[PDB]
Amino acid sequence: MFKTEFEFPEELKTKLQEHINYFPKKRQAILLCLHEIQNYYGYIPPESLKPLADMLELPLNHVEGVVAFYDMFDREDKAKYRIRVCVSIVCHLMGTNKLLKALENILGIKPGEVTPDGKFKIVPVQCLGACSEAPVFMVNDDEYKFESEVQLNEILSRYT
Amino acid sequence: EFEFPEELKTKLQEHINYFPKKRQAILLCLHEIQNYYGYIPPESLKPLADMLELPLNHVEGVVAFYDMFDREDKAKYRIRVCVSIVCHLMGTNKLLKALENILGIKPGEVTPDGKFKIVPVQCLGACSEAPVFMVNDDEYKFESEVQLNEILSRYT
Amino acid sequence: RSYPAIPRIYAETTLNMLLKRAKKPRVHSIDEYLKDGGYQALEKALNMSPEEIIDWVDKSTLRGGGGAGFPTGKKWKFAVQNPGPRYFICNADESEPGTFKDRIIIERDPHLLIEGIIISSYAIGANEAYIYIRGEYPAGYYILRDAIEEAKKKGFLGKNILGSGFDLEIYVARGAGAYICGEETALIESLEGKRGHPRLKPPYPVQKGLWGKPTVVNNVETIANVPFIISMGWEEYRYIGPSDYAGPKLFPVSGKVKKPGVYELPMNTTLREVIFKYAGGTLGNKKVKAVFSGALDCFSSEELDIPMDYSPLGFGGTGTVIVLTEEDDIVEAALKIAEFYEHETCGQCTPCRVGCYEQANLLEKIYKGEATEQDWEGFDFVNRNIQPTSICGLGAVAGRLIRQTLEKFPEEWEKYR
Amino acid sequence: SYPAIPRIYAETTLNMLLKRAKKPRVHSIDEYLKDGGYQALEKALNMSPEEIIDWVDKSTLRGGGGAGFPTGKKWKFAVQNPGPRYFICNADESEPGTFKDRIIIERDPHLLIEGIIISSYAIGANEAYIYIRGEYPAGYYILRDAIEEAKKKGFLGKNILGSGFDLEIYVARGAGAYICGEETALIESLEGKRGHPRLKPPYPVQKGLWGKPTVVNNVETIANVPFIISMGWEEYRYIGPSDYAGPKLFPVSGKVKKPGVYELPMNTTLREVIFKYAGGTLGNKKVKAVFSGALDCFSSEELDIPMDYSPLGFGGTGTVIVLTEEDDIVEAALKIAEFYEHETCGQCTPCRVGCYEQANLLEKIYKGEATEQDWEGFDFVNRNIQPTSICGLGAVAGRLIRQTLEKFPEEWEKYR
Ligand SMILES: Cc1cc2nc3c(=O)[nH]c(=O)nc-3n(C[C@H](O)[C@H](O)[C@H](O)COP(=O)(O)O)c2cc1C
Ligand SMILES: Cc1cc2nc3c(=O)[nH]c(=O)nc-3n(C[C@H](O)[C@H](O)[C@H](O)COP(=O)(O)O)c2cc1C
Ligand code: SF4
Ligand code: SF4
Ligand code: FES
Ligand code: FES
Ligand SMILES: [Cl-]
Ligand SMILES: [Cl-]
Ligand SMILES: [Cl-]
Ligand code: NA
Ligand code: NA
Ligand code: NA
Ligand code: NA
Ligand code: NA
Ligand code: NA
Ligand code: NA
């Protein structure tokens, strides 16, 4: 099955077209579209940017620069679930390091790494705006206070 | 001895000239009279009958038949409260209690200043927004006493 | 100008026809209607013969939306068999409990209604048309008066419309508090400047109506379909929904649902789908106990799988859906239905006059725990004896819903006795 | 069904912005309406836009996004320029310690929406945006749903409640950049570009989105507008001290017993925030420092200041991060340096290199691997991030850290 130019699956293309039609100008939809792409594939595939750029009526170079600039987007590692761990001042003070330890015990990985099954990636992030509930992490869109290893293990068991 | 003021008589004349036959305008005229005076004055019916070219007892029978018309009580603002099935199910009684709390009156009563009359009515055709009430021509969903109080404050 | 305040009734459509504009809760004026291709169906119609228009409306399968489901084309055919002049009447009296479908067309997309009235009037050779709108819809009245003026200024009403030689005036009349003025003969009596007293039928209005002349009375929703039939053609219209009950229908849904409002749906939709698929299910996810089809019928929770069509086993009527859940007292709800008929009988027929009064009087006593044994037996008797000698549908049905509750919920009634 | 959100504690002495948001759940439109919601909108639409501006001016309302700029005055500046005009709600909230805006978004979205509609009407904007950080996905879904609710009830769309006023609100999402909270970078992002601040002047009120007059206001600011209309400016100005009137939200975190968001008047002192409202310190340890987000460091000798926008007041966004006696100030300073390192957009050379070097060197200092030259270099870089900077980030990236050098010399000297 020889390779041919990348094309968006119909169900994804539909969603992208929806974002593009949502704002007055197509190019305003770029971040929504990139979120949608990363949601679908578990990362931003490099080959996806050219056809996205065509849909936005933007030069490819513009799209690439945007992907590079915004820290939430990941062109390198596919992962089903991103565990975003806050490493900023309040979480650090209140126990980021205990959360990271518990994550290593449960998943066998450190920040920046992906489990061997492609399931989880630990992503260190700046303040998540939940500092009263420090230390904070997210699992894709879900956000939690870390309490303990037993508690974290129960939380992660819900992601399959 | 009773005569309509000129500005009202003009408006009655417009309704009477609107339909192909004069007598068709009877309900529009009665609405106009009630809007003007806050009720239907018994003494207004004789001159109306004359303009409609109808017998007085015909006009009297019409006023009697149609529930929107009121010959008894003057009120600046009629609060029409729906008492039919959907509004009853969804909280007519809470609206009525809120009205009593704010205005001090029950259905059928007029405030002493003649400002507000609560008129219980059948289904107002807004059942998805139950419980429904009107203040003269304006129509609203009742949400709460605080909300109702602010609405009523707009009528002075 | 400024119109009176109106609650913003929710509206949703899977068909995007009658509610294409009225799904948005505001007045759509003529320029906006024209931008959507409005009044082109009128232009097309005026280039057709009246007879062809009747033929398309017949072949469309369109049925009346005012409760009886009578085939519209057939009605028009009956009227045009009688010498003119003829009159066309739009029934906007909508006063049955639960029913608020017609007002959102009137208030939000008046030009849809007006265009349908002009086509319909042309079809039956009427040069005078009326809208009879209930008195408790003041906003709809002012909105229609203004829309008619807009249509006049753009040349869609008046003499010699668009060079066709067809003349039309639409007069707007207002009711003044009587449900019975929705009955097509009482409506005509009211238009003639009298009390709203139904006439003995036959004759039917199509033979002898306003001023004794052939008169077609149609419901707002019925008329609002007509521009679509001309625009699409009868074949494409008939492709909407099941072929025997084709086309859009409006369903006003209220009571214990999460999303009360008006739904534009095909008539193969089931009652269960209306409630759970479209109206978001029940408040608190409580079990459905009963659906009241306005003040006409009571369906139990064992009858939810029926189609919303005009078939013998279908829901029928005006598609009015009032949902009661498991905690709702059926006897309390029956009392509210009784009170409605008590307040609306015109009193011409003795069993209706006395029966509607006694049904409510006695049921109140039962509800309050003040009924004697004779009051109970009397209630049962009166409920079964409102209809004899009645000359209109009100007397025929004033006992129907309540009798259904007695048969379908015996355990609850027994508790009161 | 929305993504899981931590249930941030919220408490109010005024029962305004947190009237509903004190309860940690979504309040939908029916609950909002029961509390008299959208009645302020109805009243506003019977006033002239100029009248509304005058009221917001006379209320003394100031922005809650950090700069404390008088809101009515901002509006007046926008409307002296020809239309069309745009209104933007800044929901980028990404400064460390700051979580005040999210509880309005997530729990009382209609308060924000109502404020947006009134504000848009005041400045003649027919198109409004909410720009919400990418890491608030629940807030995004909640806002989208609430907007649809508002549309269904006729508070959004064309000819709102017969007023002739048209409005659509569009919800945009960020994608991980703190700098996109800076009003000009936010606008660049809304235009589909990288979040690079623009040289000012011009200011957004003159030339903003697509070069048109644009008002950017913070979530908290906008949430005040319904109260100003409902109560009137005079009754609103009666709340708190007359020069800094009305409610303010204070996100309190770190070593307190009751971390969370507090709605209080601005005559409240910092000491009262910590000890009267937030329950005092964990373990009853002594306060060592308060970080005002990533902006300022107050010592234990500075707790008796008002939480207002006066020169000697706390100011900022009212973000209170509490460190106690055992907390290492240099470790804390490193975290602040790391934040600026990660968020400079890199357009300006001293900011780009200074934010990087400040963190690089401070890490060496903290780990005991700094040479004498690294120490001297750190001092120098910390004082030289700001030159040529075109936005506030470069101006403040060294500020808090410099304050720790001045206020806690004995801890720093331990590392040297
Ligand atoms: C008591 C009573 C009330 C009625 N109310 C209405 C009404 O409000 N609207 C309506 O269009 N038809 C109403 N009808 C039905 C009309 O008499 C008539 O069948 C209808 O207006 C015909 O139009 P259609 O064929 O388009 O349905 C009522 C009938 C009765 C017996
Ligand atoms: C680096 C930087 C980041 C900012 N982040 C935010 C933010 O997250 N939210 C916000 O409303 N304002 C933020 N601001 C301030 C805005 O530029 C702007 O002053 C504010 O949104 C105006 O609204 P206000 O007057 O209601 O405060 C930031 C400013 C800078 C310099
Ligand atoms: S059946 Fe009832 S409503 Fe109908 S004409 Fe007779 S008395 Fe009047
Ligand atoms: S000061 Fe820093 S963050 Fe601001 S524009 Fe310059 S490089 Fe970017
Ligand atoms: S410092 Fe981690 S959520 Fe704010
Ligand atoms: S039952 Fe009250 S409006 Fe219909
Ligand atoms: Cl290219
Ligand atoms: Cl006489
Ligand atoms: Cl043609
Ligand atoms: Na023809
Ligand atoms: Na005529
Ligand atoms: Na009527
Ligand atoms: Na054909
Ligand atoms: Na004023
Ligand atoms: Na003023
Ligand atoms: Na961002």
Side-chain angles (χ1 to χ4, degrees), chain A residues 2 4-160, chain B residues 2-156, chain C, chain D:
Chain A
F2 293 143
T4 60
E5 298 175 23
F6 177 95
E7 282 172 8
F8 286 123
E10 194 78 291
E11 50 161 307
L12 172 59
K13 192 170 196 193
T14 287
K15 286 178 188 166
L16 294 178
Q17 193 62 62
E18 177 161 352
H19 293 310
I20 290 167
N21 289 336
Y22 174 71
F23 298 100
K25 305 187 177 185
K26 294 182 157 64
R27 60 193 175 275
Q28 312 186 252
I30 181 164
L31 302 186
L32 282 178
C33 286
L34 287 168
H35 281 300
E36 200 66 63
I37 292 170
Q38 179 148 304
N39 180 69
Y40 187 87
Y41 290 106
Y43 78 113
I44 304 294
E47 64 276 14
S48 73
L49 288 78
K50 166 56 177 171
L52 176 61
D54 289 6
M55 293 177 83
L56 297 165
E57 300 176 351
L58 286 179
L60 172 60
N61 155 67
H62 182 313
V63 178
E64 286 165 343
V66 162
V67 175
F69 180 87
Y70 288 102
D71 282 353
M72 287 187 69
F73 304 133
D74 184 352
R75 273 181 295 188
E76 275 164 9
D77 295 319
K78 175 177 183 179
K80 190 167 182 191
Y81 305 109
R82 288 162 192 283
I83 306 174
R84 285 175 170 99
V85 173
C86 179
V87 296
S88 287
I89 177 58
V90 190
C91 294
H92 174 78
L93 206 64
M94 306 301 297
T96 295
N97 287 348
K98 296 173 179 173
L99 166 56
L100 287 173
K101 181 55 167 180
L103 286 163
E104 189 180 1
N105 291 337
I106 297 165
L107 299 178
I109 53 163
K110 284 166 186 183
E113 291 179 344
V114 188
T115 55
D117 56 5
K119 190 172 168 192
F120 294 111
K121 175 165 177 178
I122 303 178
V123 182
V125 299
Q126 301 305 298
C127 182
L128 281 171
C131 318
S132 59
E133 292 295 304
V136 178
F137 66 104
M138 303 185 80
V139 184
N140 288 349
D141 289 357
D142 297 316
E143 184 165 278
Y144 302 95
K145 169 165 181 178
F146 171 79
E147 297 286 352
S148 66
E149 189 169 311
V150 59
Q151 171 253 12
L152 175 63
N153 191 65
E154 185 73 10
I155 288 170
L156 297 177
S157 74
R158 301 172 195 155
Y159 299 94
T160 68
Chain B
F2 176 96
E3 77 186 10
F4 297 120
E6 198 69 65
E7 68 181 4
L8 173 59
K9 176 175 152 75
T10 295
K11 233 317 189 78
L12 295 171
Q13 198 59 59
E14 288 175 19
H15 297 312
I16 285 164
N17 291 325
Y18 175 73
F19 299 100
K21 312 194 188 184
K22 292 188 159 74
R23 65 189 170 275
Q24 305 186 256
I26 185 161
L27 300 187
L28 295 180
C29 287
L30 291 168
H31 278 302
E32 195 74 55
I33 291 167
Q34 180 151 301
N35 173 264
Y36 195 83
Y37 290 106
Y39 75 119
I40 304 287
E43 61 275 21
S44 73
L45 269 23
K46 171 53 177 161
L48 177 59
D50 287 353
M51 298 167 81
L52 294 173
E53 293 169 356
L54 289 177
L56 171 59
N57 89 95
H58 183 316
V59 173
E60 284 166 341
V62 164
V63 177
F65 179 86
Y66 289 103
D67 282 356
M68 285 187 73
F69 302 133
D70 187 354
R71 282 181 292 188
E72 301 267 303
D73 294 337
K74 189 190 194 305
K76 189 174 184 177
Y77 303 108
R78 288 169 188 284
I79 309 176
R80 287 174 169 100
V81 173
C82 177
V83 297
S84 286
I85 178 162
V86 189
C87 292
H88 178 76
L89 206 71
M90 302 305 294
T92 294
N93 291 345
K94 296 174 176 175
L95 167 54
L96 288 176
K97 182 61 172 183
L99 284 170
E100 191 184 354
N101 282 341
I102 297 162
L103 295 175
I105 51 161
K106 290 176 159 58
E109 294 177 346
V110 189
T111 54
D113 59 0
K115 185 177 174 194
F116 291 106
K117 176 168 178 176
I118 298 163
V119 177
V121 296
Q122 303 303 298
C123 178
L124 284 170
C127 317
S128 60
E129 309 312 304
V132 181
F133 68 101
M134 305 184 72
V135 185
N136 285 354
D137 284 356
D138 295 312
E139 187 163 87
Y140 303 95
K141 170 167 181 180
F142 170 81
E143 301 284 0
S144 71
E145 187 168 311
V146 161
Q147 170 252 4
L148 175 63
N149 193 69
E150 170 70 8
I151 289 174
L152 292 181
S153 75
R154 302 170 181 169
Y155 299 89
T156 60
Chain C
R1 59 171 165 179
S2 161
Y3 300 114
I6 306 163
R8 273 74 61 192
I9 293 165
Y10 178 65
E12 183 184 306
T13 180
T14 60
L15 294 176
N16 215 35
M17 293 171 67
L18 311 175
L19 300 189
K20 178 159 197 277
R21 284 169 300 291
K23 66 191 186 187
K24 306 299 191 70
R26 59 182 183 76
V27 176
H28 297 68
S29 282
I30 197 159
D31 282 336
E32 193 168 10
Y33 187 74
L34 288 165
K35 181 169 180 167
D36 272 357
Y39 288 107
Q40 298 188 300
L42 173 58
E43 214 162 358
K44 182 172 181 189
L46 289 171
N47 291 317
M48 295 162 68
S49 78
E51 168 171 63
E52 197 188 11
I53 293 166
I54 297 167
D55 186 47
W56 288 24
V57 169
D58 183 19
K59 287 179 161 61
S60 78
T61 84
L62 177 65
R63 287 174 171 272
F70 196 87
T72 301
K74 197 189 169 187
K75 190 188 301 198
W76 292 6
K77 276 192 283 305
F78 287 151
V80 305
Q81 305 308 302
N82 301 125
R86 307 196 193 82
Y87 298 114
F88 188 81
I89 301 169
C90 169
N91 192 339
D93 202 61
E94 180 163 73
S95 292
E96 190 165 352
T99 313
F100 51 89
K101 59 178 188 72
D102 297 341
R103 72 183 295 169
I104 65 160
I105 296 171
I106 294 162
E107 292 165 348
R108 299 169 187 193
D109 203 18
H111 290 286
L112 182 59
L113 178 57
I114 294 165
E115 178 171 14
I117 291 168
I118 302 169
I119 295 162
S120 299
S121 296
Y122 173 70
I124 68 149
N127 302 116
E128 175 177 320
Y130 292 82
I131 303 170
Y132 190 97
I133 187 167
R134 62 184 295 185
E136 306 83 353
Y137 288 171
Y141 170 79
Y142 293 122
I143 289 164
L144 288 165
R145 287 292 306 266
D146 285 349
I148 283 163
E149 293 306 311
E150 289 177 316
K152 286 188 174 159
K153 295 176 163 78
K154 300 272 179 210
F156 300 127
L157 285 171
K159 297 185 170 181
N160 184 29
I161 297 156
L162 302 181
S164 69
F166 179 54
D167 300 348
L168 187 60
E169 297 289 339
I170 305 174
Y171 301 94
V172 188
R174 297 181 70 192
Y179 167 70
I180 193 55
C181 287
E183 199 272 350
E184 61 181 347
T185 61
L187 189 162
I188 290 164
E189 288 289 308
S190 188
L191 272 178
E192 288 179 356
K194 298 180 283 260
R195 298 183 289 186
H197 280 173
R199 302 171 176 177
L200 182 61
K201 303 157 284 281
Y204 295 89
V206 287
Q207 195 187 9
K208 293 187 178 175
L210 181 67
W211 311 128
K213 308 314 280 197
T215 303
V216 172
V217 180
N218 273 303
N219 178 76
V220 164
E221 181 183 359
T222 316
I223 299 165
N225 279 259
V226 169
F228 294 96
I229 297 162
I230 301 304
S231 183
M232 298 171 168
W234 66 262
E235 306 93 330
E236 274 297 322
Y237 183 92
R238 196 159 180 178
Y239 186 53
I240 301 158
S243 68
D244 55 3
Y245 303 103
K249 176 70 187 87
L250 301 179
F251 297 97
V253 180
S254 68
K256 300 293 179 68
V257 297
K258 296 195 188 64
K259 302 166 49 188
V262 181
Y263 291 85
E264 175 174 44
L265 298 168
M267 286 184 269
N268 61 321
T269 309
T270 73
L271 179 55
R272 183 187 295 286
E273 285 167 341
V274 172
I275 295 161
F276 288 101
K277 173 168 188 187
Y278 291 107
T282 58
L283 288 180
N285 296 323
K286 294 193 165 186
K287 294 188 180 174
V288 170
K289 178 181 296 198
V291 172
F292 286 7
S293 180
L296 182 62
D297 286 294
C298 172
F299 298 95
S300 77
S301 64
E302 303 185 348
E303 297 178 276
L304 298 184
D305 293 309
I306 67 176
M308 298 302 291
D309 68 15
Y310 295 107
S311 70
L313 301 177
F315 191 95
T318 56
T320 298
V321 175
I322 306 165
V323 174
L324 295 75
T325 50
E326 52 185 289
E327 195 127 38
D328 294 319
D329 184 322
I330 205 75
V331 174
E332 180 184 359
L335 175 61
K336 291 284 161 271
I337 299 302
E339 290 169 344
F340 173 78
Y341 287 115
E342 164 189 27
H343 283 82
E344 299 302 341
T345 174
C346 81
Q348 282 188 282
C349 319
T350 285
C352 184
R353 180 177 65 258
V354 308
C356 292
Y357 172 77
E358 294 295 335
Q359 178 175 244
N361 171 51
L362 295 172
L363 185 45
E364 171 173 62
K365 293 175 188 265
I366 289 171
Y367 180 55
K368 290 189 175 189
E370 296 168 353
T372 65
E373 185 59 65
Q374 287 58 53
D375 291 338
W376 268 97
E377 291 184 19
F379 170 70
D380 174 64
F381 185 81
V382 160
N383 169 83
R384 294 165 188 284
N385 285 277
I386 307 178
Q387 174 276 156
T389 84
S390 56
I391 67 180
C392 94
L394 191 153
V397 309
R400 184 182 168 70
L401 187 157
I402 289 160
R403 176 52 57 184
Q404 286 168 6
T405 76
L406 287 160
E407 288 164 351
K408 291 173 180 177
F409 300 93
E411 66 311 305
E412 271 183 70
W413 284 95
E414 178 78 317
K415 189 73 208 310
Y416 278 80
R417 191 178 158 293
Chain D
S1 190
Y2 301 112
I5 307 166
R7 278 71 63 190
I8 292 167
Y9 180 64
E11 183 179 310
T12 179
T13 61
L14 298 172
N15 214 32
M16 296 173 65
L17 267 66
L18 301 190
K19 172 109 190 296
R20 282 171 296 296
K22 65 190 183 192
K23 300 301 180 38
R25 60 180 181 71
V26 175
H27 295 69
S28 290
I29 202 166
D30 286 343
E31 277 187 283
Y32 187 75
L33 287 168
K34 283 196 186 308
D35 279 353
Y38 285 113
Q39 298 193 307
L41 176 58
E42 291 176 276
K43 180 177 176 190
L45 290 176
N46 292 314
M47 298 161 73
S48 68
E50 174 179 301
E51 198 171 349
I52 296 169
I53 293 168
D54 188 60
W55 283 25
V56 172
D57 185 28
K58 284 174 160 74
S59 75
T60 83
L61 178 62
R62 290 180 178 262
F69 189 93
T71 306
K73 294 187 203 313
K74 184 185 311 192
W75 294 7
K76 286 190 199 159
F77 278 100
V79 302
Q80 79 186 350
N81 304 120
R85 308 196 192 80
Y86 298 111
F87 188 86
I88 301 176
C89 170
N90 191 341
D92 204 57
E93 177 167 75
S94 299
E95 193 174 350
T98 309
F99 52 87
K100 61 179 180 75
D101 297 341
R102 70 181 295 166
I103 65 162
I104 296 167
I105 291 160
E106 290 163 352
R107 304 166 181 190
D108 203 17
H110 289 286
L111 182 61
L112 177 56
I113 292 170
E114 184 169 10
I116 293 171
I117 302 163
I118 296 167
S119 302
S120 295
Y121 173 70
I123 68 155
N126 301 120
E127 163 177 339
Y129 293 82
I130 303 173
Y131 188 96
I132 187 168
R133 63 182 293 188
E135 307 86 349
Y136 286 172
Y140 166 83
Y141 291 121
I142 290 164
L143 286 168
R144 288 292 308 261
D145 286 350
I147 283 163
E148 292 309 309
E149 289 181 295
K151 295 192 68 169
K152 293 169 186 189
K153 296 290 193 179
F155 298 131
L156 283 173
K158 294 174 180 184
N159 183 26
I160 295 162
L161 302 177
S163 67
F165 176 53
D166 297 349
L167 187 62
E168 295 300 16
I169 305 171
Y170 300 91
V171 189
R173 291 182 74 195
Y178 167 68
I179 196 55
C180 286
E182 195 276 348
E183 52 178 11
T184 63
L186 191 165
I187 292 164
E188 288 292 307
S189 190
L190 274 177
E191 290 176 357
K193 289 172 288 191
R194 299 182 290 180
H196 284 168
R198 308 172 176 175
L199 181 64
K200 302 155 281 281
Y203 289 90
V205 292
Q206 195 199 2
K207 292 191 70 56
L209 181 64
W210 311 128
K212 305 300 177 187
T214 300
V215 169
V216 182
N217 276 126
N218 175 78
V219 166
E220 178 186 358
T221 318
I222 299 164
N224 280 262
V225 169
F227 294 97
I228 292 156
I229 300 306
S230 183
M231 300 173 66
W233 63 266
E234 194 167 347
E235 201 62 47
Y236 181 98
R237 185 165 62 68
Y238 275 146
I239 302 161
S242 56
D243 56 350
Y244 302 100
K248 181 64 190 92
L249 299 183
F250 297 100
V252 188
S253 66
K255 300 293 179 74
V256 293
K257 296 192 191 57
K258 300 163 50 185
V261 183
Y262 291 84
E263 172 174 46
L264 296 167
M266 288 186 260
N267 61 310
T268 308
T269 67
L270 177 58
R271 185 181 297 284
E272 286 166 339
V273 168
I274 294 167
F275 289 101
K276 175 168 178 175
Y277 292 107
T281 57
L282 287 177
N284 295 136
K285 304 182 185 302
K286 291 175 186 169
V287 170
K288 175 183 281 180
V290 172
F291 288 5
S292 178
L295 182 60
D296 291 298
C297 176
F298 296 101
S299 80
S300 61
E301 303 179 347
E302 299 179 281
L303 299 183
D304 295 308
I305 64 182
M307 300 301 290
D308 67 16
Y309 298 105
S310 75
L312 299 184
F314 191 93
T317 51
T319 298
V320 178
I321 305 164
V322 179
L323 290 79
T324 50
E325 52 186 289
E326 287 199 74
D327 295 324
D328 179 327
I329 204 77
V330 177
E331 180 184 358
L334 175 56
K335 290 283 160 280
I336 298 301
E338 291 168 345
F339 176 71
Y340 289 110
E341 163 188 27
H342 279 84
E343 300 302 338
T344 173
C345 81
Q347 279 182 285
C348 321
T349 286
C351 184
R352 178 178 69 252
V353 313
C355 289
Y356 173 76
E357 293 296 337
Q358 179 176 242
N360 175 52
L361 297 172
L362 186 40
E363 186 184 21
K364 291 187 190 189
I365 289 170
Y366 178 67
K367 292 190 170 197
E369 296 167 345
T371 66
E372 189 186 296
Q373 291 69 45
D374 296 330
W375 270 96
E376 293 192 5
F378 168 69
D379 176 65
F380 181 82
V381 295
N382 169 83
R383 294 166 190 287
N384 285 281
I385 305 176
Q386 122 88 57
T388 81
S389 63
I390 62 179
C391 91
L393 187 154
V396 306
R399 184 177 172 74
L400 186 156
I401 289 163
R402 179 45 62 178
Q403 286 170 9
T404 74
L405 288 158
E406 286 169 352
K407 294 181 185 178
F408 299 93
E410 65 306 315
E411 279 183 64
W412 282 97
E413 182 69 19
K414 216 162 295 305
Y415 280 83
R416 178 205 279 290

